Design a protein around this ligand. Structure first.
Ligand SMILES: [Cl-]
Ligand SMILES: [Cl-]
Ligand SMILES: [Cl-]
Ligand SMILES: [Cl-]
Ligand SMILES: [Cl-]
Ligand SMILES: [Cl-]
Ligand SMILES: [Mg+2]
Ligand SMILES: [Mg+2]
Length: 302
């Protein structure tokens, strides 16, 4: 029979009335406000890409190595869902060593990049990983070596296998890089299918496993596209744990995530897209496995 999920009925009411902007601004109005004193210290000015996007002190990731422990990155710890994410800005030319130090120290297995290095004529992220196997990168400040092992290029995203080595202990780890290359700044994915096909690739890699440290997610500021990716993933995980779409309150989950980093989801259309992604993803969560193959085809990755 036909049965609308509660979220589908809410989506339709909002769409019909054209109230996405109002719904979104209300979330902005109710969002948490916490201090970012460390982010604002004079010595950290050059460690921040945007003066208006900073990590709260209570949830910021601290680098381990007495000199300066600051990186613009936040731990989004979703207690009910039991999954954590580190959301961070695209690293700067002087913070690529810090970025990989954070990946090492936090034991992350995957890095999710949702932007291109150049967008709208400006450099939104440093070229922080090696583009050629034979041109490995050594971060002198943090003593790490990063090598490109292989890459699988699809039409709108690429997955790279990287080797990160702590030169101090000579221990090495495989880091998976998931790079979404067709998601515009302040925009939305081409379709729920393209987005979900990508999120499922990250999921299938095992990078979100609780056995690993938190996946690192970023775009340029690390709040819009990054927020959309984590909101959709957490909502789908909550639905999955309970096998009940009705126990999922998307706006409530977003406000919970905003307790850990400011400005997650930057436009009303990103919020609308998040609903679309969760509604479509619910089909797979609730047992229609065949939809994953459908997304792969509609995504036109090949
Ligand atoms: Cl200072
Ligand atoms: Cl790029
Ligand atoms: Cl451009
Ligand atoms: Cl840069
Ligand atoms: Cl763009
Ligand atoms: Cl905001
Ligand atoms: Mg705390
Ligand atoms: Mg080696």
């Amino acid at each position: 029979k036909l049965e609308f999920m509660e979220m589908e009925k809410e989506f339709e009411q909002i769409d019909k009335s054209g109230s996405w902007a109002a719904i979104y601004q209300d979330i902005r109005h109710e969002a948490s406000d916490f201090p970012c004193r460390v982010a604002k210290l004079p010595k950290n000015k050059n460690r921040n890409r945007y003066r208006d996007v900073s990590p709260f002190d209570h949830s910021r990731i601290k680098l381990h190595q007495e000199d300066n422990d600051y990186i613009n990155a936040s731990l989004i710890k979703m207690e009910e869902a039991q999954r954590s994410y580190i959301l961070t800005q695209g690293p700067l030319p002087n913070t690529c060593g810090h970025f990989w130090e954070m990946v090492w120290e936090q034991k992350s297995r995957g890095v999710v990049m949702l932007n291109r290095v150049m967008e709208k004529g400006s450099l939104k992220c440093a070229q922080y990983w090696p583009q050629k196997e034979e041109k490995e990168m050594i971060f002198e400040d943090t003593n790490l070596k990063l090598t490109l092992i292989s890459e699988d290029i699809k039409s709108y995203y690429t997955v790279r296998q990287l080797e990160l080595e702590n030169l101090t202990t000579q221990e090495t780890r495989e880091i998976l890089h998931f790079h979404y290359t067709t998601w515009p700044d302040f925009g939305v994915p081409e379709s729920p299918a393209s987005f979900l096909n990508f999120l499922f690739k990250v999921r299938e890699s095992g990078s979100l496993s609780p056995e690993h440290g938190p996946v690192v997610v970023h775009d340029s500021a690390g709040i819009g596209r990054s927020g959309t990716f984590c909101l959709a993933d957490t909502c789908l995980l909550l639905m999955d744990k309970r096998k009940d779409p009705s126990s999922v309150d998307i706006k409530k989950v977003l406000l919970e995530m905003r307790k850990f980093r400011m400005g997650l989801i930057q436009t009303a259309d990103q919020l609308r897209f998040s609903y679309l992604a969760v509604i479509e993803g619910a089909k797979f969560i609730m047992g229609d496995s065949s939809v994953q193959d459908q997304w792969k085809e509609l995504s036109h990755e090949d």
